[PDB]
Ligand binder design. Structure first.
Ligand SMILES: Nc1ncnc2c1ncn2[C@@H]1O[C@H](COP(=O)(O)OP(=O)(O)OC[C@H]2NC[C@H](O)[C@@H]2O)[C@@H](O)[C@H]1O
Ligand SMILES: NC(=O)c1cccnc1
Ligand SMILES: [Zn+2]
Lengths: 7, 291
């Protein structure tokens, strides 16, 4: 998935 | 809608290369990956920019820093700033840009494979891009759910609260009592399953076209600073031509440039104008723009 929305 | 070039340098020759690739591969499709840059000309206010009425209202409301407006913990402790931003940014308050209509043209020409967008303005959909071709990676206001039990709510319940003066009594779930919010992905949350799922399918589609025509991935108006969305570019097949239309070179195009990478420093709307010209679709485009 790629993980949580972040910088 | 009127645009001009970013500098005295011309980008028509570079844009011509793109049109040439599409001319040599008439049955190929394009995948776009876009960000906030494509909606700037629509007049959408940047919540992180002082000098924007939105920024100062959020500051007056004690928001600690811009992005706290999209933070789950903060929202639950004080939903007013988010509600205030929603009132100003709710879909229907703006109109699509020339670039958004370009996406529509491509769809009309059957050369649009998919458009991955980080924006929550839903101007691609508002412009007529089909639901099947759009991937709103960060959600939108079109759906609402309780943050505690996940119960589904029609988007209109939330929207009606935004027209009240002052905004108070926020939407609470009639099952568990927690706050109900629009299906916008906040920092710290996972993106919707359709994001990874569709990219999984489009990644295979890309790799398989390399061996038959040739596809094209065009990245526009994004700083590629938010993950996981920003991982897409590096995941494009080495043998698939990557194009970047952005005022500045960013992300993988800067960190790991590729021989075949085509970089175009231009405003997304000017880029749209030039591409339509080099493709010879000015007639259909004008029709859409005047429609
Ligand atoms: N008209 C136009 N054409 C091409 N590129 C443009 C334009 N206007 C801005 N830009 C470029 O688009 C990029 C926009 O970056 P940004 O504002 O950070 O937005 P994103 O799409 O990448 O990210 C969203 C952010 N919004 C909420 C979250 O706070 C994110 O950090 C940036 O690199 C600019 O050089
Ligand atoms: N596009 C946006 O409004 C936005 C807001 C916060 C974080 N990332 C994107
Ligand atoms: Zn609930």
């Amino acid at each position: 998935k790629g993980g949580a929305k972040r910088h | 809608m009127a645009s001009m070039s970013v500098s005295t340098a011309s980008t028509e020759m570079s844009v011509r290369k793109i049109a040439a690739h599409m001319k040599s591969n008439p049955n190929a499709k394009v995948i776009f990956m876009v960000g906030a840059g494509i909606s700037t000309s629509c007049g959408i206010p940047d919540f992180r920019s002082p000098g924007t009425g939105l920024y100062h209202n959020l500051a007056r409301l004690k928001l600690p820093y811009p992005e706290a407006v999209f933070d789950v913990d903060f929202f639950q402790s004080d939903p007013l700033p988010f509600y205030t931003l929603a009132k100003e940014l709710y879909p229907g308050n703006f109109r699509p840009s020339k670039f958004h209509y370009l996406l529509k043209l491509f769809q009309d020409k059957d050369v649009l494979k998919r458009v991955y967008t980080q924006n929550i303005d839903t101007l691609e959909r508002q412009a007529g891009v089909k639901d099947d071709l759009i991937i709103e990676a960060h959600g939108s206001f079109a759906h609402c759910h309780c943050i505690g039990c996940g119960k589904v709510y029609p988007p209109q319940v939330f929207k009606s609260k935004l027209a009240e003066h002052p905004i108070k009594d926020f939407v609470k779930c009639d099952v568990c009592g927690e706050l109900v919010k629009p299906a916008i992905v906040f920092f710290g949350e996972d993106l919707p399953d359709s994001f990874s799922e569709t990219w999984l399918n489009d990644s295979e589609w890309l790799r398989e076209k390399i061996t038959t025509q040739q596809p094209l991935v065009i990245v526009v108006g994004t700083s590629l600073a938010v993950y996981p969305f920003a991982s897409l570019p590096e995941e494009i097949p080495r043998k698939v031509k990557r194009v970047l239309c952005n005022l500045e070179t960013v992300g993988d195009f800067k960190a790991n440039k590729r021989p075949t990478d085509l970089i175009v420093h231009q405003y997304s709307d000017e880029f749209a104008e030039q591409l339509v010209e080099e493709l010879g679709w000015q007639e259909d485009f004008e029709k859409i723009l005047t429609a």
